[PDB]
Design a protein around this ligand. Sequence first.
Ligand SMILES: Nc1ncnc2c1ncn2[C@@H]1O[C@H](COP(=O)(O)O)[C@@H](O)[C@H]1O
Ligand SMILES: [Zn+2]
Ligand SMILES: [Zn+2]
Lengths: 80, 80, 239, 255
Amino acid sequence: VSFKITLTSDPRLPYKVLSVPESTPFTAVLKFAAEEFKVPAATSAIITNDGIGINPAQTAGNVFLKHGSELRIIPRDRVG
Amino acid sequence: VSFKITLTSDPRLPYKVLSVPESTPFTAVLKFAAEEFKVPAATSAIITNDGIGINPAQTAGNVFLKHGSELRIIPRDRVG
Amino acid sequence: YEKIRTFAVAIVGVGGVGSVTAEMLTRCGIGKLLLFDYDGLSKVQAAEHTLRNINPDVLFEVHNYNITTVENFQHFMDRISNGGLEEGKPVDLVLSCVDNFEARMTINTACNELGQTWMESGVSENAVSGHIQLIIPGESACFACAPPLVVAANIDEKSLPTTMGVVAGILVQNVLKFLLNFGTVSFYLGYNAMQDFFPTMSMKPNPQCDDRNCRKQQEEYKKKVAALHEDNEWGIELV
Amino acid sequence: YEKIRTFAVAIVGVGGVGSVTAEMLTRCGIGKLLLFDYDKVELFFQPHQAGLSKVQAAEHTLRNINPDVLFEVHNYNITTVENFQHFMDRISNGGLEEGKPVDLVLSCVDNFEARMTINTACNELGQTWMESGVSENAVSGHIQLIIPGESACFACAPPLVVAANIDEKTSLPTTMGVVAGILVQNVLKFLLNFGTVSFYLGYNAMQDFFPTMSMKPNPQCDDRNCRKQQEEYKKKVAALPEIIHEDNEWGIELV
Ligand SMILES: Nc1ncnc2c1ncn2[C@@H]1O[C@H](COP(=O)(O)O)[C@@H](O)[C@H]1O
Ligand SMILES: [Zn+2]
Ligand SMILES: [Zn+2]
């Protein structure tokens, strides 16, 4: 139900704490977090504290069960 | 007099603690410290913890009096 | 080191980052470059022409097609597997310098199937951010392990010179360290141009990655792991 | 931002770092480059250009890359008495508008004597510059911002050989490309006032370590004009004077 999401691309490593219903698709959580950080949602990706990549296209409940609370946004820069 | 000299160019920030007679020219202390770090002495420079530049061409006593014990080696890379 | 002439590198995308990347490796004396891009000459041919003059000892093979079509994709895989310095051997590295996610997913799909190590690079739209990433299938995360939102949500994808130069430079430095085995290879190195922040990370495979060949290479990786002072007149004392 | 066209940059040394630096600023649309170098092209540069002076070969290539950039070049050694005075004249009056100083000097020379010459000139003039370097073994480099009086000058923290007055008796393309890109990025941030300007940014290629620091003036610097600019800086300091969410039907709470 709750996550702490850290922006890896900022030297201060700021984080946001989001509380979310289990059934919310985690894609919406990633978008919301990117908007709070004012970075582009479309090119954002998300990993665990251990650095394991996550496919956001699953429920927030399932992300929490599989990976817990501590997640990190990484940019996916699109130009060459 | 004693100095703690940190190598700024290494992610580990390793340091050496040198004890030296007051009258030793600090150029010899800088040389000795660079050799312990196995970085080139000739191109090494030295600053304080606050980042104040130091000209080593003075006694170790005066460096201590003027700047204290905590110093940092920076490279002065010579090629263009 | 002259062992650099022993290797072959494939570069996909010869735009901003890819062209600087190709020039740097040419000046280093890489054994062979393979260049892939899709459009006077074509981009890959213009690049080949300039690079040949910079270092006549480098071998070049270039291909002007879209690797994300069915016929060209198989050709792409053929040349990764057999277009190495010695014909019939794989290239030692693929470098992704393409400017969209579809082409990165295509390279990723190919390299997961082949077990081919590659590095991916990128620069942000607004030119103040970029990165490089090392993908050893099965050992480090592939590009599909942590897909960007737009890819995961199945949405259609519907100051530059400085940042591109930095990203290409760190890309080729990582290539040299990987091939010649000096220094520390970065599995991820970011560049934040606004604040001069260069984060490093090491990204790990997801056991349920969408790419089933990523999963199979993860199994093989685990199997392989399972299988093993000229003078001192002053009296300076270190303390 | 096209405010970039209003500025002029002088580059001393058009070698590995300097030539990439000059190309990048040309492609960015800098108003004017001044190029200083004493050496010829020998075999950024091209084969047919061997035997020309570096500044002229660079000017020939860069003019056609961007016809809107102005160029002034000088093929001489800035450390000689006659050329040094000309060097200072052009720093002071060779800006985009003749009679105005350049907005920035960039040091891309490959010895300490030439850096000390630039340092001596900029302290006398009160001219901001940035210094760059690459190590002999090509696995290390840095950039540094020198605002005379405000940040350390090159003589505030001299390398050992300079302080001991010993005579300078003693993978490259990748490291040079990084240092030039990092140099020009700092130039853009300084001139166009976006982001954070680094007063020092190092590059350790072996371990991908990029230390930043801020080096401060030495009150007893050997350069007398550094000391005088320190006094002027202190007098000058004493004298001064959002979050939209496109939808949210899911109930995500910031907490
Ligand atoms: N006193 C000087 N005046 C003008 N140019 C110089 C001076 N000292 C060094 N250089 C140039 O600085 C450049 C540095 O080259 P590189 O080491 O390849 O970056 C070379 O092209 C040198 O000719
Ligand atoms: Zn994967
Ligand atoms: Zn000074």
